[PDB]
Design an enzyme around this catalytic site. Structure first.
Site, PDB file in Angstrom:
ATOM      1  CG  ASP A 156      13.898  10.553   2.664  1.00 36.27           C
ATOM      2  OD1 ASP A 156      14.017   9.325   2.854  1.00 36.27           O
ATOM      3  OD2 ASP A 156      12.810  11.155   2.775  1.00 36.27           O
ATOM      4  CG  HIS A 183      -4.418 -12.751  -4.395  1.00 34.56           C
ATOM      5  ND1 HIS A 183      -4.398 -12.532  -5.755  1.00 34.56           N
ATOM      6  CD2 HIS A 183      -3.164 -13.131  -4.056  1.00 34.56           C
ATOM      7  CE1 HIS A 183      -3.186 -12.776  -6.219  1.00 34.56           C
ATOM      8  NE2 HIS A 183      -2.418 -13.139  -5.209  1.00 34.56           N
TER       9      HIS A 183
HETATM   10 MG   LIG Z   1      10.918  10.345   2.150  1.00 33.44          MG
HETATM   11 MG   LIG Z   2      13.557   7.351   3.404  1.00 36.12          MG
HETATM   12 MG   LIG Z   3     -10.218 -14.182  -5.461  1.00 28.15          MG
END
Ligand SMILES: [Mg+2]
Ligand SMILES: [Mg+2]
Ligand SMILES: [Mg+2]
Ligand SMILES: [Mg+2]
EC number: 3.1.-.-
Length: 1341
Positions: A8, A828
RNA sequence: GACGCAUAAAGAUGAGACGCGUUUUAGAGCUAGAAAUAGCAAGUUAAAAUAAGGCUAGUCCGUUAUCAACUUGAAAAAGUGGCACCGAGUCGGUGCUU
DNA sequence: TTGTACTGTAGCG
DNA sequence: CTGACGCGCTACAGTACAA
DNA sequence: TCTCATCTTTATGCGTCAG
């Protein structure tokens, strides 16, 4: 014997597990080295490696570019000084030395402390005469007297150093085009050229248009109301054609000479003078008024005539600041005397003292002083100037980025023309000074290195030093511009030695069209089955449809070819959907340009067309294109060559010339494109041709075709993924080493891939032009009528954001300009400094100054109250999402906070996808290293790629619930469950082995069918399956292989085994010890102080007098055992302690450790007892307590709470009380299950208290949390369980952090003492943690 | 589970530039003052540095990637650690083996 | 004079 | 014709007290 | 923040990769 490995993988974690064929985790007695008493330890073969995520090279690139910009600015100043040196030596031989020494204090200066004149009275007279630099600049521009050479140098150096932007390519002369009165000779020219003698009833100039906003919807109606309209689209003066050009290349309206396409007069209107320039003034006046309107937007006004309007505007700012400051002081003294000290002296309260002397910005000062101005009388003019953001402004401000370099160039040229007569050396090298101001290295040349930079690609004609004056005679710009692209485009995958084709290459479009077309089948009533298109039919339909339409649909193929040519009443076609995905776009473009169909259809001139498209793809500079394209001037006329150089192409394909048309079959003699044009009745496509063993393409590709570190150094992409790939491959290698060098049967890797429904996938992947159409139709605008656009133009980010906002700025209520997007700003909402998010839900196209003022913060409350109605108007029109509206209205909820910083970023998802794909490739390459003459690869180890949906369903269907807040054991549990599910899947269904094993393959919508298939395969684990009709169906308790009697899943013993594994307390959690690298300190420079912690900003700059940096970053700590010269009556007392080796002292320490430790005051240092201790070094103390070394002066928690699985399941089910979305009967079972073990909450608290009293030792926080839990023990199970989930932050491994209960907030207990670990047991853990070396530090010293 | 095309989303890598920001110095503060100070005046600008620095000395490079311990090796890199069973509070116990 | 504990700081568009 | 069964997360600075 | 370029991984539409 046989075993399997599950993996994992995340951005900061690699979970691993080893299972047998019985789904059990083995346990072994591992040897333990070191001087300790322990010689053997028992560990389970399951765990997880934790590490800090790899950083992208964005910040390093930005720092490198800033370093280069600073170096080149210093070199510009050095060139100007080199010019001025010999003349400055006559009048002041120490002037440049005083400018260099100006940073130093008076006792360090070799010359007099006054930089410019070297004496007090002349300097004071200078600063009285010229309060700012702009006064000196305007004096030197406007006056004609002989000035001091030092003042001329100061003005020219200020001009060259802060030189302004280069986004305007024209001349833009401010000497005569700055004035707005050019309208009157514009209509004089209109009277002369247009032979009707109109009445020149001249009204207000473009000032009337600029009073509200520069727009067509103001300008046109204003000058039609002011002067009576004789021609709406042919008024011939101050038009939108002459100010802000039209969006398409539409023909001239009411033409004078010829009908030609029109645009804005920036760079693509120079060819639009072919009405007269191609057949041999209103357009010259159009250029003049374009310069006038641009510069009147940049600079406000100049009332009295001058050649320096920027300096005049800056002096106007100074004078208005002086007047407003005097008026403000008078009003404050007369009306609010108690506020005078706060505003004008106390510099910490964002007053005027805080605006000038303090760190408060302009908008902070405005929001502080606005209520004060509101309560006082006589502040109407100050209020209306504050609302315009014009009150008490400075000259060096954030919005000075809108000034182009041509204004500074004009002012510098004016100064040099004034002072050339008095100083002959200014006239001798005026062009050199102008070149110093105006030179800029092209982006396609890059760094000017001499073979010592890994970022440089430039080749030079001669080995001379590069100056701005000899740059053209030294740097080979054509070869450098070619190498700019050739170093960056990828190679062909099938033929690795030579480059790919451009995307818009005619041969590439031909190959794509024929590859799509060769598998098109048609059926009718004539014959029985659908048949492939023959080569003659394919040639006919290409000539009839693909060379007459830019995009061809299957309906056109029905009614224009088959209805007429080889006439059929009705034909059904398979192999294509409604439209062909392929098109001959470049053929239509070149047919529109060259106007010669026979030239494009001709065969012998194919290579020159390929080279033309290659030139048009590689280059974008006009002179370089004309340099490469002048070879073909003997076939093409001059007008068509001037038109053809405009055809910019961008993008490259994936296949080369040699692959698709270079190599030929040995027997047939045909290329791949020749086979696609006609292959008899087989009609093979590209993959068939490269995979059929009958043709000789396959082994030609085969003939066209080491350490792990070199196996990863050659892979391109981000360097962040290489960290995770290294970690997981080393984990797999160590796991193979643990089991006696025996390879597994199979390795299961959890991938972030998925499967979703056909309609869901198509709804999420529709064209953004459709988004624009339904949004604008819902809100009912006419923007698409005025500005037409196609889908391929919205790939540009700024145009897409312009159309998403319906042509208006979304911070200020004003219209945007479609042709001036270079000066507008993409912003942003949540800033880059806070959270990494480059989504379309986080992006605004706004005006530049509004973005610069809205720095490092959410947009403030005032803009939210101003434009919140417009945000809702876009929100219900489906043009912005709810997340975008939440980001825009974030300041209403308190703005940025620590809760907002939490949660995953989508870059982590993309990174883990890239990682796991590369892990699958590298593990398959590494594990299977043997092959045979008939077997091309022996599958010794089967790399199995499971999807996360299967493991998630396995967790949610058998009550193996996962929560991430308790411990880091969930990575290991996910790895174990991945291994179990993968091995059970390949054991249960051997016929589906090719579906899941990497490298193998088995060969209502297709995606929907595959989604149902993947959902249904998981059913065999279940005892009872509820069908879609609501009726249950039983399966046997013991599963079998089906074809064989071998046993693959027992729903008795194996579920108990999995429950036992998930409840195992010992899991090898390893934090990777890492030597810190990066910036040495925090970037802020602190003022002077007497402290010794200040770090010198330069070698000769003592921080006691000059200030310096703070917060040094420790690369690694070092255990020293030595004596310290302690006491007034000095004795050598022995001591053992940690010392932090910082990043800039790393090289000095590793060069000679003994001398470095002796310089720190230590002596009689034991050299062999020096132990390098990186960050997260692990120590073990009494009662199993563990501490991780965060630094030489701070520790971290190192233990993991192994909570029983029943409590974890109770915590998962108690939270998410009414959002399981399963079945009502299931919901009532977990209702009763949580209600009749409600007492588990007390046991969880008991477990946490015992664990904290054993290893955390935060007793005050323990009493706090016990009191808070006792005081709200009567709340419902939802909020209680949610904050017990929050409660594990106290016991969680890592650095302490402030969590919170119901209402109390618990401050973290910091371990700011590394004294105790000096006598603890140091643990050296391997990459899996199974192999350990335990060193008892109490035996040293 | 890979390839080609079309449509998405979310991200990377390199180059060329701009505007601020910070730090020290320069921009003579005046009066009452034994003063700890108090009143008043003033404030907008400039120079230099912007990772310490490095040597192949370039208008170049210096914050990405690499990195448990031990034994070899300049480094690259190579090598080093028994198994089975019964159990479980971060692993323990029992039995064979060299 | 040396350890602790609590609160604040941190380059950016 | 070919498979079933339909991903994340703080070390140091400054001030104030215990010896 | 701007201007230039080049890629990558996933999702859907079509085709294909074979005993
Ligand atoms: Mg993990
Ligand atoms: Mg995973
Ligand atoms: Mg900005
Ligand atoms: Mg690093």
């Amino acid at each position: 014997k046989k075993y399997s490995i599950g993996l994992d993988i995340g951005t900061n974690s690699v979970g691993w597990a080893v299972i047998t064929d019985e789904y059990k985790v083995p346990s072994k007695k591992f040897k333990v080295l070191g001087n300790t008493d322990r010689h053997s330890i028992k560990k389970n073969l399951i765990g997880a490696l934790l590490f800090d995520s790899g950083e992208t090279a964005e910040r390093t690139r930005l720092k490198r570019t800033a370093r280069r910009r600073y170096t080149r600015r210093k070199n510009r100043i050095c060139y100007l000084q080199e010019i001025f040196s010999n003349e400055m030596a006559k009048v002041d031989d120490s002037f440049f030395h005083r400018l260099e020494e100006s940073f130093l204090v008076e006792e360090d200066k070799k010359h007099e402390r006054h930089p410019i004149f070297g004496n007090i009275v002349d300097e004071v007279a200078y600063h009285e005469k010229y309060p700012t630099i702009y006064h000196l600049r305007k004096k030197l521009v406007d006056s004609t007297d002989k000035a001091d050479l030092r003042l001329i140098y100061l003005a020219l150096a200020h001009m060259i150093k802060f030189r302004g932007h280069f986004l305007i390519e024209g001349d833009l002369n401010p000497d005569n085009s700055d004035v707005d009165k050019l309208f009157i000779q514009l209509v004089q020219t209109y009277n002369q050229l247009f032979e009707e003698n109109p009445i020149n009833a001249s009204g207000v100039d473009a000032k009337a248009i600029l009073s509200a906003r520069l727009s067509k919807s103001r300008r046109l109606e204003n000058l039609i109301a002011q002067l009576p309209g004789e021609k709406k689209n042919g008024l011939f003066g101050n038009l939108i054609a002459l100010s802000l050009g039209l969006t398409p290349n539409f023909k001239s309206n009411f033409d004078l000479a010829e009908d030609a396409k029109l645009q804005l007069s920036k760079d693509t209107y120079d060819d639009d003078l072919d009405n007269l320039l191609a057949q041999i003034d209103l357009f010259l006046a159009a250029k003049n008024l374009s310069d006038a309107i641009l510069l009147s937007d940049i600079l406000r006004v100049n009332t009295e005539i001058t050649k320096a309007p920027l300096s005049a505007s800056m002096i106007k700012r100074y004078d208005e600041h002086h007047q407003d400051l005097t008026l403000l002081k008078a009003l404050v003294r007369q009306q609010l005397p108690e506020k005078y000290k706060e505003i004008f002296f106390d510099q910490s309260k964002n007053g005027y003292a805080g605006y000038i002397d303090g760190g408060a910005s302009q908008e902070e000062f405005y929001k502080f002083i606005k209520p004060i101005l509101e309560k006082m009388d006589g502040t109407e003019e100050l209020l209306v100037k504050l609302n315009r953001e014009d009150l008490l402004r400075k000259q060096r401000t954030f919005d000075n980025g809108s000034i182009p370099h041509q204004i500074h160039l004009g002012e510098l040229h004016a100064i040099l023309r004034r002072q050339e007569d008095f100083y002959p050396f200014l006239k001798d090298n005026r062009e050199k000074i102008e070149k110093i101001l105006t030179f800029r290295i092209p982006y396609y040349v890059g760094p000017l290195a001499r073979g010592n930079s890994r970022f440089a690609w430039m080749t030079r004609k001669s080995e001379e030093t590069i100056t701005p004056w000899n740059f053209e005679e030294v740097v080979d710009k054509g070869a450098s511009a070619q190498s700019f692209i050739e170093r960056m485009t990828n190679f062909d995958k099938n033929l690795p030695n030579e480059k790919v084709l451009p995307k818009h290459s005619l041969l590439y479009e031909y190959f794509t069209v024929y590859n799509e077309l060769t598998k098109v089948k048609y059926v009718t009533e004539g014959m029985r089955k659908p048949a492939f298109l023959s080569g003659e039919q394919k040639k006919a339909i290409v000539d009839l449809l693909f060379k007459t339409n830019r995009k061809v649909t299957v309906k056109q193929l029905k009614e224009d070819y088959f209805k007429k040519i080889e006439c059929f009443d009705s034909v059904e076609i398979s192999g294509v959907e409604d439209r062909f995905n392929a098109s001959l776009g470049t053929y239509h473009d070149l047919l529109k340009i060259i106007k010669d169909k026979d030239f494009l259809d001709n065969e012998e001139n194919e290579d020159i067309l390929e080279d033309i498209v290659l030139t048009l793809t590689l280059f974008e500079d006009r002179e370089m294109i004309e340099e490469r394209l002048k070879t073909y001037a003997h076939l093409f006329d001059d007008k068509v060559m001037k038109q053809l150089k405009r055809r910019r192409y961008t993008g490259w394909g994936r296949l080369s010339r040699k692959l698709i048309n270079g190599i030929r079959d040995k027997q047939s003699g045909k290329t791949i494109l020749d086979f696609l044009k006609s292959d008899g009745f087989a009609n093979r496509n590209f993959m068939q041709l490269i995979h059929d063993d009958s043709l000789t393409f396959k082994e030609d590709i085969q003939k066209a075709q080491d350490s792990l570190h070199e196996h990863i150094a050659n892979l391109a992409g981000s360097p962040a993924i290489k960290k995770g790939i290294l970690q997981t491959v080393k984990v797999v290698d160590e796991l193979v080493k643990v089991m006696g060098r025996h390879k597994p049967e199979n390795i299961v890797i959890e991938m972030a891939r998925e499967n979703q429904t056909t309609q869901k996938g198509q709804k999420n992947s529709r064209e953004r032009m459709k988004r624009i159409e339904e949004g604008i139709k819902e809100l009912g605008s006419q923007i698409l009528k005025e500005h037409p656009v196609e889908n391929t133009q919205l790939q540009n980010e700024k145009l897409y954001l312009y159309y998403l906002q319906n042509g208006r700025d979304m911070y200020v209520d004003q219209e945007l300009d479609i042709n001036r997007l270079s000066d507008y700003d993409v912003d942003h909402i949540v800033p880059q400094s806070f959270l990494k998010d480059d989504s379309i839900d986080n992006k605004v196209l706004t005006r530049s100054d509004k973005n610069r003022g809205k720095s490092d913060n959410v947009p403030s409350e005032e803009v939210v109250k101003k434009m919140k109605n417009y945000w809702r108007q876009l929100l219900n029109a489906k043009l912005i999402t709810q997340r975008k509206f939440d980001n825009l209205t974030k300041a209403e909820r308190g703005g940025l906070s620590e809760l907002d910083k939490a949660g995953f970023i989508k870059r982590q998802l993309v990174e883990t996808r890239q990682i796991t794909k590369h892990v699958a490739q590298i593990l398959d390459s590494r594990m299977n290293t043997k092959y045979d003459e008939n077997d091309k690869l022996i599958r010794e180890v089967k790399v199995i790629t499971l999807k996360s949906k299967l493991v998630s369903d396995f967790r949610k269907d058998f009550q193996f619930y996962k929560v991430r807040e308790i411990n880091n054991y969930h990575h290991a549990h996910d790895a174990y469950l991945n291994a179990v599910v993968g091995t059970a899947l390949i054991k249960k269904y051997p016929k589906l082995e090719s579906e899941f094993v990497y490298g193998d393959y088995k060969v209502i919508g297709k995606a929907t069918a595959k989604y149902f298939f993947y959902s249904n395969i998981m059913n065999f684990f279940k005892t009872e399956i509820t069908l879609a009709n609501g009726e249950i169906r039983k399966r046997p308790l013991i599963e079998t292989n089906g074809e064989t009697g071998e046993i693959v899943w027992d729903k008795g013993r194996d579920f108990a085994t999995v429950r036992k594994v998930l409840s195992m307390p010992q899991v090898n959690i390893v934090k990777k010890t890492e030597v810190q690298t990066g910036g040495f300190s925090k970037e802020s420079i602190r003022p002077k102080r007497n402290s010794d912690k200040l770090i010198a900003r330069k070698k000769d700059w003592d921080p006691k007098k000059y200030g310096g940096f703070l917060w040094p970053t420790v690369a690694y700590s070092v255990l020293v055992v030595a004596k310290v010269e302690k006491g007034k009556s000095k004795k050598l007392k022995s001591v053992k302690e940690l010392l932090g080796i910082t990043i800039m002292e790393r090289s000095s320490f590793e060069k000679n450790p003994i001398d470095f430790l002796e310089a720190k005051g230590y002596k009689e240092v034991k050299k062999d007892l020096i132990i390098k201790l990186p960050k997260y070094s692990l120590f073990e103390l009494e009662n199993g307590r563990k501490r991780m070394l965060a630094s030489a002066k701070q520790l971290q928690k190192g233990n993991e709470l192994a909570l029983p699985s029943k409590y974890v399941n109770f915590l998962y089910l108690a939270s998410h009380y009414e959002k399981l979305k399963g079945s009502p009967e299931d919901n009532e079972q977990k209702q009763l299950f949580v209600e009749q073990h409600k007492h588990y909450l007390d046991e969880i608290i008991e477990q946490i208290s015992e664990f904290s009293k054993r290893v955390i030792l935060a007793d005050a926080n323990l009493d706090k949390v016990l009191s808070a839990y006792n005081k709200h023990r009567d709340k419902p199970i939802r909020e209680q369980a949610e904050n017990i989930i929050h409660l594990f932050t106290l016991t969680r491994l890592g650095a302490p952090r402030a969590f919170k209960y119901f209402d109390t907030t618990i401050d973290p207990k910091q371990y700011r003492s590394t004294k105790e670990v000096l006598d603890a047991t140091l643990i050296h853990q391997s990459i899996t943690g199974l192999y350990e070396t335990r060193i008892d530090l109490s035996q040293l010293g």
